Amino acid sequence: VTQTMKGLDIQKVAGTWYSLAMAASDISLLDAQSAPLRVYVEELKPTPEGNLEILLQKWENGECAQKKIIAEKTKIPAVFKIDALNENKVLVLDTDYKKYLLFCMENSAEPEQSLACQCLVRTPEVDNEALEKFDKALKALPMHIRLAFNPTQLEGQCHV
Ligand SMILES: [Cl-]
Ligand SMILES: [N+]
Ligand SMILES: [N+]
Ligand SMILES: [N+]
Ligand SMILES: [N+]
Ligand SMILES: [N+]
Ligand SMILES: [N+]
Ligand SMILES: [N+]
Ligand SMILES: [N+]
Ligand code: NA
Numbered sequence: 140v141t142q143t144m145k146g147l148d149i150q151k152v153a154g155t156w157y158s159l160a161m162a163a164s165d166i167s168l169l170d171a172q173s174a175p176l177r178v179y180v181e182e183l184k185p186t187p188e189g190n191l192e193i194l195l196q197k198w199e200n201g202e203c204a205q206k207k208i209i210a211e212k213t214k215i216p217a218v219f220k221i222d223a224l225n226e227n228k229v230l231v232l233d234t235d236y237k238k239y240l241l242f243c244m245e246n247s248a249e250p251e252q253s254l255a256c257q258c259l260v261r262t263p264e265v266d267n268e269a270l271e272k273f274d275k276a277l278k279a280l281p282m283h284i285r286l287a288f289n290p291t292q293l294e295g296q297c298h299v
Pocket of ligand 6: 222223
């Protein structure tokens with residue numbers, strides 16, 4: 140049920156990103172700042188072997204904490220394997236490289252109980268084109284929670 144970006148060129152995604160919007164299949168995955176998938180991307184770091192480090196922040200004990208997820212390449216440039224956040228896959232749905240990137244995380248063993256997707260932007264501003272693409276990509280996905288952040292939140296501590 141999940142699109143992939145064909146021919147993703149990972150080298151072109153390196154840098155800071157901001158989580159502009161996120162949505163999940165289960166409310167509890169994103170409900171409250173403590174939710175397990177309430178993670179805010181800070182940076183994408185493609186590696187020399189073509190794997191991807193995903194640097195995130197999350198609230199922990201009243202502080203914005205860092206978490207690094209190692210995502211390992213597969214035969215499809217846009218799909219990476221992980222072992223974090225109870226997930227086992229990262230899918231890059233679409234990117235223009237220069238402005239936005241859409242991705243989802245899930246666990247193959249139960250996507251309906253694990254799907255979370257994000258709209259990332261390079262600059263901490265609302266990009267309505269990117270949000271339109273995100274919402275279109277998600278149109279037929281079974282999301283039950285959706286959040287979209289404003290520039291103050293993007294400049295805040297862990298999106299507050
Ligand atoms: Cl957690
Ligand atoms: N490239
Ligand atoms: N759910
Ligand atoms: N919250
Ligand atoms: N990959
Ligand atoms: N996992
Ligand atoms: N697109
Ligand atoms: N591009
Ligand atoms: N926009
Ligand atoms: Na980087």
